Design a binder for this molecule. Structure first.
Ligand SMILES: [Cl-]
Ligand SMILES: [Cl-]
Lengths: 347, 355
């Protein structure tokens, strides 16, 4: 029973009154009410694993900012490797390094092994009461694989890439199991009530053009081929986002997903020319703009709207997550600007 | 016209016929070489090494002696030379990295900054160029270099290394008038610095726009590329009877090659995220291309290194206009033998793409 669905409409190239906006990490430490809930939870994993708390932080930006046109599931990108028994605490107690390691990895069952995520989705979907669509998400196979091979956050992905060039056979094995896992994970979230899904390929941008095709994109394509594309009588749009992936939009546009995420390095007008006929686009403002005065924030919104131009097919967002020191009022000025200034570009 | 024994590097940059694809490597003088680390220890630190022309020459020549395949030398020097000469007080915080005592935050700060004179105020750099040019004895061309105005500006506004560049970009959006004033002054400075290096014997120059890739497409045009264009227009174009090729390198700038190619510089540097075949199709008629291998490949076994060299050569295809390099600097933990396999693969495997 969706009351506001312009976010979905834009992704599906349907007419809209204004350009929709949401923001990566809109539930995060820049919000004092998030910091309160996080302290109430006690630690970050408790917040993630408690569906009531995950819901609480998910709703917080929506209640603060009526301009936001979508909710995104609050969770950790690393749920799946954690579930595989790798012991997430940002590092892993168990680290992938041999083919033998990978073969032993189980493919997590969404409801039996990741039930708390599924519970969070159901809880959020209920509590939203149709106010805005709910976005489910997961990290990409390549991105999750690097976390599992690096053993956590990495200096420069030397180990992950070395293993890629030395033992591509083992890396294929790992990526394939992760593709399997991500597919069922997202399908789980969709069954639980997610109305769109986004794949975050956060580290795909560090790959060479060739390695990106073989070791990241091919596995996102596998996932999209396995996703539930319709639920609750509506299409469930898929958004692929490779940060730093602007060079590669053309191939990304042929995977069959509805939309591609963009970061600020890619001119969105150029992106629309290159692949606009095949996908919706989401993005792409540099988050650092939010540290500037409201006039500058408005000016940058106007520039980006002008670059995209007239008509549907754009969802406004940043090109990366907001950072903890941003003034919530500057975030608000951003969302307001998108709705106020974009109206002229529709109709 | 002064003598070179090997000039295939220059010829590739100028789209002239070459026998093999030339190769050199960013940071080819650096901590991955044990002889470098020994010289650096004898100097005490990096800064002392940069400010002693005899030792800067010594490390500049080391990779050439170890690796006969290398087709160019690059001036060993500090990217932060100019803002130090400007008076901002470069030092090294024990646990972090280079920092400046003084940080740029206002138009008034910027107006006060002087434009260093290369020979009068950076004589130790010009001496290094002269010394290297002499000691090379024409074995390979010498590359001079500088940071770009945008890249230098970020160090001066942040006051050292930064992860997110929040302060630099905040100033870009909040105080464009001041940020442009800084960029303008730095372009003038970089121009005379590079020209001093050329007059001292540099035979090519590379502008390292290391942090230009963090800019939006729109901001890149106004706050970085426009100032590299200023520099290129002001550079000495010929010296010692030769054209002096200019290489512009914005790491992560692959989306922007078309505009970079309109500046008038001979060549553009690429990183591994850009398919070099695609790059050649997009701008190869206008510029030579340098790059573009992922430095991380050098951690892999030599067979993998050769296969990746082979792939990149196949992607560029037949004919001049390519200088092989990494897309980034080599890191200290790469085995010298792996770097060696790399250079040997480029010369051996590229022969078939020429003639
Ligand atoms: Cl744009
Ligand atoms: Cl390539």
């Amino acid at each position: 029973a969706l009351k506001n669905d312009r976010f979905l409409r834009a992704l599906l190239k349907q007419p809209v009154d204004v350009t929709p906006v949401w923001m990566m990490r809109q539930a995060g430490r820049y919000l004092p009410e998030y910091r309160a809930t996080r302290a109430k939870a006690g630690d970050f994993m408790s917040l993630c694993m408690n569906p009531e708390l995950a819901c609480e932080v998910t709703l917080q930006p929506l209640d603060r900012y009526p301009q936001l046109d979508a909710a995104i599931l609050f969770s950790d990108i690393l749920t799946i490797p954690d579930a595989m028994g790798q012991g997430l605490y940002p590092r892993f107690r168990k680290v992938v390094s041999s083919l033998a390691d990978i073969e032993a990895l189980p493919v997590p069952d969404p409801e039996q092994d990741l039930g708390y995520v599924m519970d969070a989705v159901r809880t959020i979907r209920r509590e939203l009461n149709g106010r805005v669509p709910l976005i489910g998400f997961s990290g990409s196979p390549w991105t999750l694989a690097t976390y599992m091979v690096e053993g956590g956050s990495s200096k420069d992905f030397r180990k992950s890439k070395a293993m890629l060039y030395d033992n591509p056979k083992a890396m294929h094995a790992l990526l394939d199991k992760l593709a399997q896992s991500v597919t069922s994970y997202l399908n789980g979230q969709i069954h639980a009530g997610a109305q769109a899904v986004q794949i975050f390929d956060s580290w795909g941008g560090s790959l060479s053009a060739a390695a990106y095709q073989e070791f990241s994109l091919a596995y996102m394509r596998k996932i999209v081929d396995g996703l539930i594309r319709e639920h609750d009588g509506r299409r469930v749009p898929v958004i692929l986002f490779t940060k730093g992936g602007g060079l590669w939009l053309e191939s990304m546009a042929e995977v069959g997903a509805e939309a591609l995420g963009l970061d600020w390095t890619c001119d969105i007008g150029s992106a629309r020319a290159r692949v606009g006929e095949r996908v919706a686009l989401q993005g792409n403002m540099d988050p650092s703009v939010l540290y500037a005065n409201p006039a500058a924030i408005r000016a940058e919104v106007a520039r980006i709207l002008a670059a995209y131009g007239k008509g549907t097919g754009h969802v406004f967002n940043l090109g990366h997550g907001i950072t903890p020191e941003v003034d919530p009022a500057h975030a608000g000025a951003f969302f307001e600007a998108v709705h106020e200034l974009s109206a002229q570009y529709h109709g």
